[PDB]
Curated annotation (Swiss-Prot), chain A:
Its main location: cytoplasm. The keyword Acyltransferase does not apply. GO terms for molecular function: ATP binding; ATP hydrolysis activity; ATP-dependent protein folding chaperone; unfolded protein binding. It is found in: Cytoplasm. This is T-complex protein 1 subunit eta. Keywords: ATP-binding, Chaperone, Cytoplasm, Nucleotide-binding. It comes from the Eukaryota. Belongs to the TCP-1 chaperonin family. GO terms for biological process: chaperone mediated protein folding independent of cofactor; protein folding. The lineage of its organism: Eukaryota, Fungi, Dikarya, Ascomycota, Saccharomycotina. It comes from Saccharomyces cerevisiae (strain ATCC 204508 / S288c).
From Swiss-Prot, chain B:
This is T-complex protein 1 subunit alpha. Belongs to the TCP-1 chaperonin family. Coiled coil: none annotated. It comes from the Eukaryota. Heterooligomeric complex of about 850 to 900 kDa that forms two stacked rings, 12 to 16 nm in diameter. Molecular chaperone; assists the folding of proteins upon ATP hydrolysis. Known to play a role, in vitro, in the folding of actin and tubulin. In yeast may play a role in mitotic spindle formation. It comes from Saccharomyces cerevisiae (strain ATCC 204508 / S288c). It is found in: Cytoplasm.
From Swiss-Prot, chain D:
It comes from Saccharomyces cerevisiae (strain ATCC 204508 / S288c). The keyword Chaperone applies. Its main location: cytoplasm. It is found in: Cytoplasm. Disulfide bonds: none annotated. This is T-complex protein 1 subunit theta. The modification Phosphoserine is found at S150. GO terms for molecular function: ATP binding; ATP hydrolysis activity; ATP-dependent protein folding chaperone; unfolded protein binding. It comes from the Eukaryota. One of its GO terms (cellular component) is cytoplasm. GO terms for biological process: chaperone mediated protein folding independent of cofactor; protein folding. Belongs to the TCP-1 chaperonin family.
Swiss-Prot record, chain G:
Heterooligomeric complex of about 850 to 900 kDa that forms two stacked rings, 12 to 16 nm in diameter. This is T-complex protein 1 subunit gamma. Molecular chaperone; assists the folding of proteins upon ATP hydrolysis. Known to play a role, in vitro, in the folding of actin and tubulin. In yeast may play a role in mitotic spindle formation. The chain holds residues 17 to 107 of 534 of the full protein. It is found in: Cytoplasm. Belongs to the TCP-1 chaperonin family.
Amino acid sequence: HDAIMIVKRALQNKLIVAGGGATEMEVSKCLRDYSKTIAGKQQMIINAFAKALEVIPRQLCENAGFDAIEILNKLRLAHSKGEKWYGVVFETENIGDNFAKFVWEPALVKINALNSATEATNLILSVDETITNKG
Amino acid sequence: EKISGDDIRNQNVLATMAVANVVKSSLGPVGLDKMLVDDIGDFTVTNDGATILSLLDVQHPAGKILVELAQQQDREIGDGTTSVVIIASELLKRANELVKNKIHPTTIITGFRVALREAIRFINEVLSTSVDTLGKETLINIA
Amino acid sequence: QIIKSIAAIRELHQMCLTSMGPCGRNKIIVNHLGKIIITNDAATMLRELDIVHPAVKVLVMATEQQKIDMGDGTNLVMILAGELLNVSEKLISMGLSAVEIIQGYNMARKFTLKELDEMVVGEITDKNDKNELLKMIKPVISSKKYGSEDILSELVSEAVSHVLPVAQQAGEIPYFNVDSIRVVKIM
Amino acid sequence: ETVKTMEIGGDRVTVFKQEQGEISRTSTIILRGATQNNLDDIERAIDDGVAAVKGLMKPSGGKLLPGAGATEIELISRITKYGERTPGLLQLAIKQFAVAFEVVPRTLAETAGLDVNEVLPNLYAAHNVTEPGAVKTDHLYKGVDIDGESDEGVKDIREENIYDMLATKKFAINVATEAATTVLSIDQIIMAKK
Amino acid sequence: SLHDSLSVVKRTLESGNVVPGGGCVEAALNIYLDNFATTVGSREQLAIAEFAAALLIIPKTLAVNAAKDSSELVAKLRSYHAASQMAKPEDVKRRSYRNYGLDLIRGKIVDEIHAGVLEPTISKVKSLKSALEACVAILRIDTMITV
Amino acid sequence: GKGQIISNINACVAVQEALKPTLGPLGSDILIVTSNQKTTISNDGATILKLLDVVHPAAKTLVDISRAQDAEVGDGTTSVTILAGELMKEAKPFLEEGISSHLIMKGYRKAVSLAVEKINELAVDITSEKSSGRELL
Amino acid sequence: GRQAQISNITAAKAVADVIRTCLGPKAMLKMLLDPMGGLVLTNDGHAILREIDVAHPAAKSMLELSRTQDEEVGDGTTTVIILAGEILAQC
């Protein structure tokens, strides 16, 4: 029954990406390399967006007991060198491949959340005045 | 009085930041000068950042370190008095975010010492003997 | 006292300066019914805001002239009228009475309106074609929700062409109506 | 002719429409989206969009002028020309009348993230040139560019087919002058505690 | 007045070791410390990353007095040197050029080697060594006792 | 002016700092006591934000996008608020240097277009591997 | 910050505030109140400036620059301060 429930959620959504910080670290790394043509005031804005994407794996390691300081330094070294599929193990702290452990996450969760976080951010940054009427 | 913890750490950064923000206007030849008024009421006008820190009156233990930093720079070279203060003050500004990250100050100091000696060999690949003396002259634009 | 009347409008002047234009920004205004309402159009925001200054209500009533008789210029009338008071402070400091200031604008208004007839290069043939209506409708739909003006252009141009009846060589009888187009929205 | 029931936005609703016969002047624009607040501005943008169709009638509905900062800068050169032409004390008010139009391109540069020292001198040099001839040449259509793309400078606003209708611009000038006239004509006010 | 103009070249050529100025030293070290921070780790990567970005305040301050946008000059300066370091360790280059500086007079990015702005290395090493020596003594004080 | 944006940043961080420990299946849970005196404990962030009912518009905006995340999808309700709030913190020092908020908004939009393009590349879709609906699962 | 630039323009205007009517052959007479009870009714522009006690240091710079012009030429002392004072007002 446990094996059926794992493949059940994978059949509903055919778009699957590697979780466990793998995809989160690669997106932040690619934006820093492509920022060379984004050079100018638009470069530092996207460079901060890549750093803002690191809060997701942080709280996951802090809530599980792992040290968020050491896990981020060792993950980037193993991600940039060799294979990019190396993630963070959720049981025992160590470098590992989530694609090897067959632990997957649906991509539509991160895609819909990325557009919703950016759209809601543009609404708040655009408000220079707020008036609240009583009633 | 005795003050410890992160309260005195933030005051030391804001004190050096206030001293740094005064001399940031005189950096470079295009920079702006300033007037230093004493208790008598007189003043002076100069664009040299080395003479400003000597005549500037600031009461603070780290502020006097910057005064000794300016005195040591003039006895060795004499150029970059404003630059050496801004670089030293910028590291104190970024050290604030490292405190909220639970980073120990020794690792902050050790990380800078390793990066200092490592950057020495990086300059060796940068620095080079005088070249470009054939086919063109780069000495004509210096003067 | 003439400066204090400008400072009261200046408080709401900077809000409208960030409105007009495709890069403009939107302000959140909480309605008295406990519902968050945000919009670019100033004529809608000025109604929900509580303004106790009577001098500001002059620009509010002047804004309704842009909303009712026209379909554009609600953000433009607040920027133009607000700047005329700022440039007038230089003449007040010099000791010039408000008569020559008002008389100067009336003489300059007739000079500007006369030149507007020479500022027109092309003229719309009023063909009411689907591709021809995209030229007039696009700038009006613009300056709100930037980036969606290309898709919303085909939706408005197709609905207007359906309201307009087929006729030729008759300009006496009006055709289009504002209330004849009702927009629906579903989450 | 036709009454059916279709799914709009995920819910089953009965649609009321037709095809050819019994020509009707009523139309409906269907909108869809996830955000509820974004659907309010798009709905209000259509109401302001269809209201411009009323201005397409005989009273100068076909005439047009370039917008996005193109006309506001070009009118400054004509107003300053009439300043020295008209003698008397009106010279002070005419010169300040053209300066008051510089706020439109300034806000477009500030709301776009562009520097104030950049867009303003570039617009003056574009609309002021020395042409060996009486007929004006080159391009008077230069507006305020959004930038954030391409390389540098501005571009012809006619490329994007964006312009301000004369009925909107000409009627807005008369309202703007009468709005500031009332404020400048009131030298005293009397209010009460509210 | 000629003696003042000759003293600029004589004192510059007096030291056989010179490096390009105008922000070339601070920008070059920023790229080298980025890849070096990943090769060490052990909680020291965050300190090197902040120490590398701290060198960009010198060209940013000069851009303020030059009326030019600091976000345009500093950000593009980092991308120009980072693109030139791609083929640098390979000992081969085609379109890759180094020594991209900043001109405060003309407000444009030009080569400082052709511009004629040079500073000796002796002033470079003693500047970064004395700046950190004074910075460590400040961070080592956790308590202020005033009698 | 620009000072109101800074006040809105702290409003999103105050909501984020409460939802930071709630990220993950092993994360902490928030205990909210309503004025009705009924105390409930929920792991998912939707119900947590529904009981608060924050009057502040920027904090309420994060609640609306969280309800839509739990409705149309059902996963990522806590992560969408943390990501949107942390993005506000990176734009806070940019306003102090004189950078306008418009290019900051348009700067993040350019990064999303490059990020979504890389998501489809990092995804795993096998075609020529000579597989079927079973061997993959 | 920007506060010192405002005080520099304000100090230059405060010095020129006294000599506003002191320019030209029609210049009127000024009354300087001394703390000891004395008064100076002379209408000379540069003769009053030496007895004016100022606080902001930029006001002392205007007195030193006007003293140099007073030695070279006898007139035009108040002309330079008014001309340079109005530049900061327009700028």
